[PDB]
Amino acid sequence: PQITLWQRPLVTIKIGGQLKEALLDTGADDTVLEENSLPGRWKPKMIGGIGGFIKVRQYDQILIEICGHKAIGTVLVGPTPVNIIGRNLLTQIGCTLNF
Amino acid sequence: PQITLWQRPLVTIKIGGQLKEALLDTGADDTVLEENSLPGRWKPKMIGGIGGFIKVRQYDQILIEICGHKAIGTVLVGPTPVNIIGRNLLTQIGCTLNF
């Protein structure tokens, strides 16, 4: 579909047998989800945003279903106020900005 | 135009006689620009992002030219690593997400 920006662009994601809502964020190079129970190995990593840097855990080869669209990629888990779908993923689902 | 997300969506903005580059951010409710010399009165305000809260100054009725498209609205000035064009503005220029 087509999302206008009068309200936040929130969408249903299915990650590791769990259902969540995430914001489609063109302003994010990466996808960062709040602490969820995800299986596999992960490494320590740090991402910056507007007030600072938070340490997250990177999980590679993670399968996600964004609004029914499947994609595989890097997913960062940490203390984010919201589940963010970033550029690494948006490209997989052929998402563009039009104006 | 149409922006694919292989690279960050950066665009030329013209604000108060100055030329800048800004990121089109669907993940932002507001537009926050780095400290620039803007005339008028402003109030203290705070915005949160992924590492915390930063205090900014709100300027209302600010004219901006986003990729040649004029719009008027609220603009927040503060210590952001990047000039962000948020939802308040994206709607004015008829910007949508498609996939």
């Binding site: 945003g49 963010i84 | 949160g48």
Partner: peptide, 5 residues
């Protein structure tokens, strides 16, 4: 890196 407000 990555959401304002």
């Amino acid at each position: 890196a990555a959401x304002v407000x």
